[PDB]
Amino acid sequence: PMFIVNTNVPRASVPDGFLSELTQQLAQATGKPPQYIAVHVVPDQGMAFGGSSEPCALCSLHSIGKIGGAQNRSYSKLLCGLLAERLRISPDRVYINYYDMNAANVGWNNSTFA
Amino acid sequence: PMFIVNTNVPRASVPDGFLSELTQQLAQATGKPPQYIAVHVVPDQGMAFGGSSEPCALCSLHSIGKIGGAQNRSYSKLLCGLLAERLRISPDRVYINYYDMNAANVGWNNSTFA
Amino acid sequence: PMFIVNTNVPRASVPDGFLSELTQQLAQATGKPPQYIAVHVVPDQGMAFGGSSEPCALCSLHSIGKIGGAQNRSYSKLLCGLLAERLRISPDRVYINYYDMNAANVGWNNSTFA
């Protein structure tokens, strides 16, 4: 699985530890070994939400399965919680797009997961 | 709706007010309320289009509904128009990927739009 | 087709010519003229793979068709090979998401490809 965060919060406000924290919390939440979890956080971005440049985040979670109605509500609670606590972003200024990827459509190690 | 623009145009050449103009014109085009529109502009990117480093852009528009054949033609004319006028990028060096997101696959405010 | 690479490899470790090499190699791989290929390389990223900040990449390939089981295995071998050779990233530290776009969902030059 892969989780990408894009945010207008400054780099200095992103805690050391945050990438590892997301890795651990996603590994637990998705049920997948942490070895497969990739995380990417992009601060200092030129973005607006609702026409305002108050702290916000645009995120994506891609997984091969483990994506669906209730699972996504649960990931949204977990991930908005982490963003509010660690980056001080209001949950109502966060979007997370969820992508259920086909195994044949994810490349890794010179091949795919199919 | 969420609209992201990645470009090799330098940050000094993105005018004041561009994020606000995009938010407004996206609200005019999709008819969704401005309060829910997110916009993100990433300049100074290492990009080529057709093997050339002349000004170009790669963009994405995600929306829950309001995506389709004639709608996306209308969005493309609006958005290439804004990129040409404001960032001086030729329309034929712009790609925009359109994504019709399932409400259940969009997280916000600790939950989803389901 | 559009190929995007995000990596923690530093800018100075990205060799001259890389965007043209990726344009040429993807044009031959997808059997399309290079005038259609857009490439985007983003170094210096705050990212981890499996909880480690060793060199890694998160990439996307979007195309109108030419996306499938065998085709995606072939693109992964080519692209992991280029990232290992040029950026010194281990193939088992690369994810590539593949997207078969419908023509109606790709904007270009004030309209779509539909």
Numbering used by the authors:
A (entry chain B), B (entry chain C), C (entry chain A): 1 to 114
Q: What text does the study give?
A:
MIF has two enzymatic activities: an evolutionarily well conserved keto-enol tautomerase activity and a thiol-protein oxido-reductase activity that is mediated by the C56ALC59 motif. X-ray structural studies have consistently shown that MIF exists as a homotrimer.
To elucidate the role of intersubunit interactions involving Leu46 on the structure and stability of MIF, we compared the structural stability, and biophysical properties of wt, L46A, L46F and L46G mutants at the secondary, tertiary and quaternary structure levels. To understand the role of Leu46 mutations on the three-dimensional structure of MIF, we also determined the crystal structures of L46F, L46A and L46G huMIF at 1.70 Å, 1.70 Å and 1.60 Å, respectively. Similar to the wild type species, Leu46 mutants crystallized as homotrimeric proteins with dimensions of approximately 35 Å×50 Å×50 Å. In agreement with our previous structural studies, X-ray crystal structures of MIF variants demonstrate that the Leu46 mutants conserve the same three-dimensional structure pattern as the wt protein. Using hydroxyphenylpyruvate as a substrate, we showed that all Leu46 mutants are enzymatically active. Thus, decreasing the hydrophobicity of residue 46 (via mutations L46A and L46G) destabilizes the hydrophobic pocket and results in distant structural perturbation that is transmitted through the backbone, affecting the tertiary structure of the MIF. Taken together, our data suggest that the intersubunit interactions involving the residue Leu46 play a key role in the structural stability of MIF and provide new insights into the role of a novel intersubunit hydrophobic pocket in modulating MIF’s conformation, stability, and potentially its receptor binding and biological activity.
